[PDB]
């Protein structure tokens, strides 16, 4: 059982009424697995602010997994990967590759995500794309090895079954 | 559409030891697509010369896409990736992975290409392998998402 | 005929808790190929000790290929990638990708290996995962292009 934080990165999340549907898509993928969503926040497309939350969640809250979504595109404003890399002690390129659906012949556009994956302290951090469909496919691609990955990073155990 | 620059990097080709037929393969791949070759150049495996052309096409000419080919192997002098990375604002690893044909059941020689992919200003730059065959397969691998990637980097639309 | 060094990185094996059977799997994969294992070493998950052997084999022994196994995972003690990367003149990301078995329909546990691949001087170095299964499967993935890669890196010819 691993504590997960979902961070939705966009300035559009501070412009009034809209339901964060990507957040919901992510929860669905995790449903049933050794995961418990212990945090959820919206943050602007401002590296300083993204880093403050990631820093807080890893260093103080001690979350096991942080799934950010959005800001990984080719647009000059998408700087989630850069902001994240600067906070990582080491990266896990294999997970970044899985999120791009490399060699799966599933969704070609998924290859454009610059999202990174890495560890800070005892917290695994993955940058998922910003659309509901994108975040969903990228997370489902890593799901099979996510519990094993988290057990190594966090040193915490997990049970193979329904939760 | 998008203006493209093709930069062939080869010591042998530059010194006239052999002819460049790779650009010919690249042109065919682009034919029929929202691309138009605005420039072509041949330089040796020398970072200083590779960069001069990259800066020129991106900063002066403002080309939308730069496709280099060659100098991405494991040979000591193959230094196109290093030269290119020095000029990029940010990289797009997904495209570099596509050019290495990652995922094929049969381990490809393409995996030996150290080519990178990235953005400088509003120009997308891709390092394709130097062989005609290699450059073709690598370019075809990215073609499906090339137009969209370019629209995102340049801001220009296509049809 | 390329000279190979096998470096096993394992706290347990170094402590003598359980013997190294991974080198056996590696040797079997290379059997029948233009390879001769000239050196074997066993060290714990300690960067200084890992670097010491890598420098000795690349700089003093002149080995052509170094295959390390172990210490590439996500556990806090796994630092083979860091220790290795810092000694490389250049990286060959395509080989690191092949070792992660990227592209399998079923997400592989190999995706959790942070092992790198690169060149130091005229020596090609690859970080394989630590289990017999892990090292075996990752090495089989790169085997098809290994002789070619070494010929380019070492300058030594190969049919």
TrEMBL record, chain A:
Which Pfam families is this protein grouped with? MoCF_biosynth
Q: Can the keyword ATP-binding be found in this entry's annotation?
A: no
| Annotated keywords | Molybdenum cofactor biosynthesis
Give the top-rank taxon of the lineage listed in the UniProt record for this protein. Answer: Bacteria
The MoaB/Mog domain sits at: 5-149
In its keyword annotation, does this UniProt entry include Transport? no
Pathway(s) it belongs to: Cofactor biosynthesis; molybdopterin biosynthesis
Gene Ontology biological process terms, A to Z: Mo-molybdopterin cofactor biosynthetic process
Segments traversing the membrane: none
Note the CDD domains from the entry: MogA_MoaB
Protein name in the entry: Molybdopterin biosynthesis enzyme, MoaB
- What is the organism of origin for this protein? Thermus thermophilus (strain ATCC 27634 / DSM 579 / HB8)
Automatic annotation (TrEMBL), chains B, C:
Q: Describe the location of the MoaB/Mog domain by residue ranges.
A: 5-149
Fetch the SMART domains from UniProt: MoCF_biosynth
User: Which PROSITE patterns is this protein grouped with?
Assistant: MOCF_BIOSYNTHESIS_1 (PS01078)
Q: Which UniProt keywords apply?
A: Molybdenum cofactor biosynthesis
Which protein is depicted? Molybdopterin biosynthesis enzyme, MoaB
Superkingdom as given in the UniProt entry: Bacteria
One BP annotation, GO: Mo-molybdopterin cofactor biosynthetic process
Q: Which organism is it from?
A: Thermus thermophilus (strain ATCC 27634 / DSM 579 / HB8)
Record's NCBIfam families? molyb_syn (TIGR00177)
Known pathway: Cofactor biosynthesis; molybdopterin biosynthesis
Entries under SUPFAM superfamilies matching the protein: Molybdenum cofactor biosynthesis proteins (SSF53218)
InterPro entries recorded: MoaB/Mog-like_dom_sf, MoaB/Mog_dom, MoCF_biosynth_CS, MPT_Adenylyltrnsfr/MoaC-Rel
Alphabetical list of CDD domains matching this protein:
MogA_MoaB
């Amino acid at each position: 059982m691993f504590r997960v934080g979902i961070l939705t990165v966009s300035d559009k999340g501070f412009r009034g009424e809209r339901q964060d549907t990507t957040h919901l898509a992510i929860r669905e993928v995790l449903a049933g697995g050794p995961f418990e969503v212990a945090a959820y926040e919206l943050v602007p497309d401002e590296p300083p602010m993204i880093k403050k939350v990631l820093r807080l969640w890893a260093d103080r809250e001690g979350l096991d997994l942080i799934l950010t979504n959005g800001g990984t595109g080719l647009a000059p404003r998408d700087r989630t990967p850069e902001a994240t890399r600067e906070l990582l002690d080491r990266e896990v390129p294999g997970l970044a590759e899985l999120m791009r659906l490399v060699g799966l012949r599933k969704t070609p556009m998924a290859a454009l995500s610059r999202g990174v994956a890495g560890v800070r302290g005892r917290t695994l951090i993955l940058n998922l794309p910003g659309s509901p469909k994108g975040a969903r496919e990228s997370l489902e691609a890593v799901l099979p090895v996510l519990p094993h990955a988290l057990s190594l990073v966090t040193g915490k155990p997990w049970k193979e079954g329904h939760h």
